[PDB]
Design a protein around this nucleic acid. Structure first.
Lengths: 118, 212, 116, 46, 121
RNA sequence: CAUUGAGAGGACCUUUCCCUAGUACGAGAGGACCGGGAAGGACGCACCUCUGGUGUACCAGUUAUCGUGCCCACGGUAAACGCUGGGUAGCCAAGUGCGGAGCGGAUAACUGCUGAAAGCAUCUAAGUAGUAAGCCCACCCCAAGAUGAGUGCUCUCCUA
RNA sequence: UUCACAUCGACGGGAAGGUUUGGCACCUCGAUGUCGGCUCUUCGCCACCUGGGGCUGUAGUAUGUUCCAAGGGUUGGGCUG
RNA sequence: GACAACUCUCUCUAAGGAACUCGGCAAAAUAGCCCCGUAACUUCGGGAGAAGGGGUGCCCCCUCACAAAGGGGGUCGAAGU
RNA sequence: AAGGUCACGGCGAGACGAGCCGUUUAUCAUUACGAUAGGUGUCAAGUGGAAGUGCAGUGAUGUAUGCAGCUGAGGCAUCCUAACAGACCCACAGACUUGAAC
C-alpha cells in the first residue's frame, strides 16, 4: 500500500511488457539473429504469414522493442519492422545466428545480396 | 463559455497503447499531483458571470504567500499552487468547500480539449515562425534565409502592422481540440489520451470537455 | 535553443575545451585549492568528481583510464594511494566552490575550488 | 544606416542618463556584497 | 516519396525497363507520392520487341518505394528500389506477369495487381 | 492571484470515391438535384511514442605520426570531429495527433406570402417567410496604458 | 428551321477606368538607379474556380450568357534575359 | 559570460537526383602504383592516363634478377593508395 | 509591515531584461507537500564485447572470464558539496464633495 511518484513511464511500460509477456512468451532477439515471424492478419484465412529474415536492429523503447528485419524476396530487398509486443504476431523462432560484430547492420543494405538472402 | 467543468493535470511522457484489435496508437500519459479541489465559485449574484474555480499542486506553506494562502483558507481547503476557473452556464451545483472531485467524468465523454504552455523556442526567425522560404543557396545569391521584401514602394511610406517579422515563437498557451479519450487508471491516477499535448513532461495542462 | 543540452561548453572550441578540462583538473589535483572562473569551476567539479571516484576502485583498468585522462604521470599514482584513505565514506561531493572578487580587467566572476 | 540628422540635448540626456542609471543599478548589489563581506560567517571570499 | 523526376523500375513485363515518372494524379501533393498513387510516366528505355517504345507517355502505379510505409498493425514496410506497373485506367495492366513482391493495402483499389503478384508479403 | 472583454489577430479552404441510385430524365446512348458517409490536397496549431536526419554528450573500427621509458594499452594532431560506423536527451520532418463546427443573427442577387396607389394585377408602398464560401457572432490565443485604466477573493498598516 | 434582344450583333452612338502605346513638359537631375527572376506583402473587381440564383435553341450529364459575392485558391515543367 | 535571430568558414543530411538556374555557378563525386584493355579520326607525331574493369591492409611459405618483386593460403574490418 | 528586488542554486524559460522552480535539522508516522543544481548508487538507453590472464595458432587473429567495459544530456533514491552571509525598495487609513440609513 504505497502511493506512486512521477516515475510512471517505467511502471506503465513495465506492466505493459509484463502483460504482453503474460499473453505470449517471447525469447529475446539479439542483433544478428536469423528469425521467423508468424503474423495474424484477418480475412486471409491462412492466419500464419511467413516472415523469415535477419534482424538488423532492436530499437528497444519498452513496448516498442522492435525488430528491423530483412529478406531478399525474388525482386529485391524487403526491410520490414516488427513490434514484438503487438497482438498481431503469433510466435518467433530464432532459426540461426550470423555472429556479426555490429549492433546496426545498416551497411548490409546496398551490399551484395548473396549475403542477405535470409 | 465552456460546456462543463474540466480538470487539470501534468504531462508524464508519451507511449503507445496497443489496442486488442491490433492497432498501435500514440498516447500521452496524464498524471494528477493532487485532486482538483473546487476552491471558489462565482455566480450571477455576486459576480457578472458564473464560473467554478479549482486549483492544483498542494504544497508547503512557505511556498505560498499571505494573500494566496488566505484566499485558500477562506474556503477551508489545502494550500495549493495552481488555480484556474471554468466559465459555466448558470445551472451549476458546486460548493467551494473541498469538493475533491474524482476523475470519472471523462471516460464516457470520448472527446476532450486540452490547453497548455507550448515549449518556447525563443527569438526565432521568419523561416520557422511563419513558414517562409529561403533564397537561393548558391548562384551568387546573398539573401540566404533573410526576410526579403518588407513593404510596398513610396505610396505606403511605411510597413503594415502585423507584418511577419522574427520574434519570440513559443511560450503562450494553446488549445488542441476534440482529442478522444482512452484507458484511465483508477489506481495509477493516470489517464491515457491519444494525441500530443502542448509541452514537455512536467507542465500544467488544462483538460476540459469539448465546445463543438 | 538549448533545451536539455547539459554539456557545459566554455568560450573555447571542443578539443581546446577538452584540453582545458584535462589540464585544469590535473593542476587542480596537483595543488588542491585553485583559482578559476565559475564556468571553469563547475566544469572542473564534474570531471574531478569523475577522477576521484574513478580511482576509488583501484584496479588496473581504472588506473589506465585515469592515467589516460590526466596529463602528468606521477600524479595519478599519487591519487589512488590517497583517495581511499581520505575520501572513503564521503560518497560524492569532493569539492567546494568558494567564490571571490572579480578579476581586474574583465569583471570576470571568479571562483575558487577546494577539495572537501 | 547613415543618420539623417542629429539628436537634441533632450534625447541625449535621456539616453545617457538611462546608461548611467543602468550604472546606478549595479552598486546597491555591490553595497550588498560589501555589507555581506563584513563580519559574519559567510562561505565565500577566501 | 516519389518526386516528379525519379526513375522507377518496372514491376511487370509490359515492355519497359525503367521510367521517368511525371506529376502524380489523385493526391494533389505531387512532391510526396506514397503507395497506390498513379503517376504519369514517360519511358526512359524499353524492350525493343514490344509496342512500348522510347519517349512514350503512359500511366503507371507506384508499387514499391524506398520510402517507408506506416501500417496500423505496427509494421513498417520499405523496399530498396522504386517500382511501377504500366497500367491502364480500367484496372488491369497490359503486362501479365508481375515481377517482385508488393504490399496488400492496394488490394482495396487495384485487385488485379495483387492477384497477379508472386508474393503479397 | 483570479478572470469579464472593448479592441485586435488567426482560423473559418477545397477535391475525388461510395450509398441514395444506374433512381428521376432519355427511343437508346448516357446519367441527376437533395441529404449522408469515407479517403485525400494545401494551410495551421502542436509533439518525438514509432520511422529517421543531426547530435563536436557518446561509444566502436582504422591510417600516418609524436608523446606516456619500452611491448600491450591509451592520450595529442591531421582546422571549428583525421576519415568512417551507428546513437540517448534536445531540435526537426519526411514522421505522429488535431482543426476548419453552428434549424446561430441580419442581409446582397433571387423565389415568395398576404397586398394597396389606377374595385385587374404586382415580392412592398404596411407587415412578413426561405437563403450565399459574403458580414457579424460562436471557434483558438493575446488582451483594463479599454487613462473609459474593470470586477471578485485575500494579506498588511504597528511603538514613541 | 419560324423568331432583333437563349446566343452573336453589322452601320452608327454614349460613357467609365488610368493597367498599354501615345500627347504636354508640371516636381526630380549639388544623382527619382530602368527590364526579368527569387523572397515577402497588401489591395481592386472589369470573376478562372469555389457558394447562392435568373434565362437557356436548359430532356439529364455538361453547358452558353448573366446577377450577388474578392473569404480562399489560382500547379510542376522544355524554349527564351 | 551566454549558447537568440541572422551573416560568414566548415561537417552531415531520410526519399529523389539538376526538377534550381541566365547557365551543373558552387558544392558533391574521380583520384596513388601494378595488370588487362582502349574507339571515331589524323598532319601517322597523337588522341591516350581515351573510355571501361580488376587487385591493393596485415601475417605464412617457397620461387627468388638470390634488393625490388610474384603465386597460393589464412586473417580482421561495414570500408585496405 | 503585507509584497517585491538583489544575491544565491538553476530551468523543459531565455539575446539582455523577463518569467518559472528552489533558497536546509531541505519530515516524524498510517498512505499525495521540505531534493534546486552537481556528484554518487542503481534502472532504462547507446556502442557493443574492454584491460589483464589462460587456451588454440609459426604469426596475423579467434576464444572463456563477460549482453562484459565505457558512456549515464533521461528516471528514482541519497543531504556528500553549493543553496551561507546578506542588503535594499515599499511604511504610518489613503485629499476635496453629495445621498442613504445607522
Amino acid at each position: 500500500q504505497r502511493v506512486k511518484l512521477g516515475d510512471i513511464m517505467g511502471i506503465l511500460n513495465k506492466k505493459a511488457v509484463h502483460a504482453a509477456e503474460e499473453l505470449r512468451p517471447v525469447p529475446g532477439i539479439r542483433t544478428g539473429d536469423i528469425v521467423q515471424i508468424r503474423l495474424e492478419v484477418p480475412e486471409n484465412k491462412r492466419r500464419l504469414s511467413v516472415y523469415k529474415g535477419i534482424v538488423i536492429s532492436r530499437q528497444n523503447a519498452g513496448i516498442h522493442t522492435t525488430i528491423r528485419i530483412r529478406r531478399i524476396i525474388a525482386g529485391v530487398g524487403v526491410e520490414i519492422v516488427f513490434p514484438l509486443y503487438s497482438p498481431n504476431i503469433k510466435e518467433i523462432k530464432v532459426v540461426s545466428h550470423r555472429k556479426v560484430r555490429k549492433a546496426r547492420l545498416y551497411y548490409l543494405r546496398d551490399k551484395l545480396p548473396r549475403l542477405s538472402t535470409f | 463559455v465552456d460546456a462543463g467543468i474540466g480538470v487539470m493535470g501534468t504531462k508524464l511522457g508519451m507511449m503507445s497503447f496497443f489496442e486488442e484489435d491490433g492497432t498501435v496508437v500514440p498516447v500521452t500519459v496524464i498524471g494528477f499531483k493532487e485532486g482538483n479541489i473546487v476552491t471558489q465559485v462565482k455566480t450571477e449574484s455576486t459576480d457578472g458571470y458564473n464560473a467554478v474555480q479549482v486549483g492544483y499542486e498542494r504544497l508547503r506553506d512557505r511556498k505560498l504567500t499571505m494573500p494566496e494562502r488566505g484566499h485558500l483558507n477562506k474556503a477551508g481547503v489545502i494550500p495549493m499552487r495552481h488555480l484556474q476557473e471554468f466559465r459555466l452556464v448558470s445551472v451549476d451545483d458546486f460548493t467551494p468547500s473541498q469538493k475533491l472531485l474524482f476523475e470519472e467524468l471523462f471516460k464516457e465523454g470520448d472527446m476532450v480539449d486540452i490547453s497548455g504552455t507550448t515549449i518556447g523556442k525563443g527569438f526565432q526567425g521568419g523561416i520557422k515562425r511563419h513558414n517562409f522560404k529561403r533564397g537561393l543557396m548558391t548562384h551568387g545569391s546573398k539573401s540566404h534565409r533573410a526576410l526579403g521584401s518588407i513593404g510596398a514602394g513610396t505610396t505606403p511610406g511605411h510597413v503594415y502592422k502585423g507584418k511577419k517579422m522574427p520574434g519570440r515563437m513559443g511560450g503562450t498557451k494553446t488549445k488542441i481540440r476534440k482529442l478522444k479519450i482512452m484507458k484511465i487508471d483508477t489506481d495509477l491516477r493516470v489517464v491515457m489520451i491519444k494525441g500530443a499535448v502542448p509541452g514537455k513532461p512536467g507542465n500544467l495542462l488544462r483538460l476540459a470537455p469539448a465546445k463543438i | 535553443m538549448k533545451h536539455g543540452r547539459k554539456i557545459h561548453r566554455l568560450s573555447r572550441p571542443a578539443d581546446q575545451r577538452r584540453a582545458l578540462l584535462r589540464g585544469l583538473t590535473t593542476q587542480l589535483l596537483k595543488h588542491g585549492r585553485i583559482k578559476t572562473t565559475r564556468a571553469k569551476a563547475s566544469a572542473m567539479r564534474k570531471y574531478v568528481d569523475k577522477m576521484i571516484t574513478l580511482a576509488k576502485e583501484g584496479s588496473l583498468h581504472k588506473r589506465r583510464q585515469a592515467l589516460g585522462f590526466i596529463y602528468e604521470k606521477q600524479i595519478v599514482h599519487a591519487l589512488f594511494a590517497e583517495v581511499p584513505e581520505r575520501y572513503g565514506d564521503r560518497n560524492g561531493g569532493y569539492t567546494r566552490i568558494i567564490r571571490t572578487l572579480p578579476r581586474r580587467g574583465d569583471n570576470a566572476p571568479m571562483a575558487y575550488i577546494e577539495l572537501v | 544606416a547613415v543618420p539623417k540628422k542629429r539628436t537634441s540635448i533632450y534625447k541625449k540626456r535621456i539616453r545617457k542618463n538611462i546608461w548611467k542609471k543602468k550604472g546606478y543599478w549595479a552598486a546597491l548589489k555591490a553595497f550588498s556584497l560589501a555589507k555581506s563581506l563584513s563580519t559574519g560567517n559567510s562561505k565565500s571570499f577566501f | 516519396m516519389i518526386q516528379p523526376q525519379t526513375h522507377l523500375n518496372v514491376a511487370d513485363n509490359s515492355g519497359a525497363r525503367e521510367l521517368m515518372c511525371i506529376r502524380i494524379i489523385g493526391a494533389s501533393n505531387r512532391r510526396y507520392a506514397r503507395i497506390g498513387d498513379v503517376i504519369v510516366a514517360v519511358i526512359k528505355e524499353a524492350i525493343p520487341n514490344t509496342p512500348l517504345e522510347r519517349s512514350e507517355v503512359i500511366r503507371a502505379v507506384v508499387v514499391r518505394t524506398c520510402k517507408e510505409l506506416k501500417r496500423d498493425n505496427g509494421m513498417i514496410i520499405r523496399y530498396d528500389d522504386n517500382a511501377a506497373v504500366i497500367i491502364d485506367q480500367e484496372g488491369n495492366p497490359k503486362g501479365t506477369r508481375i515481377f517482385g513482391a508488393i504490399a496488400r493495402e492496394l488490394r482495396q483499389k487495384f485487385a488485379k495487381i495483387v492477384s497477379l503478384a508472386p508474393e503479397v508479403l
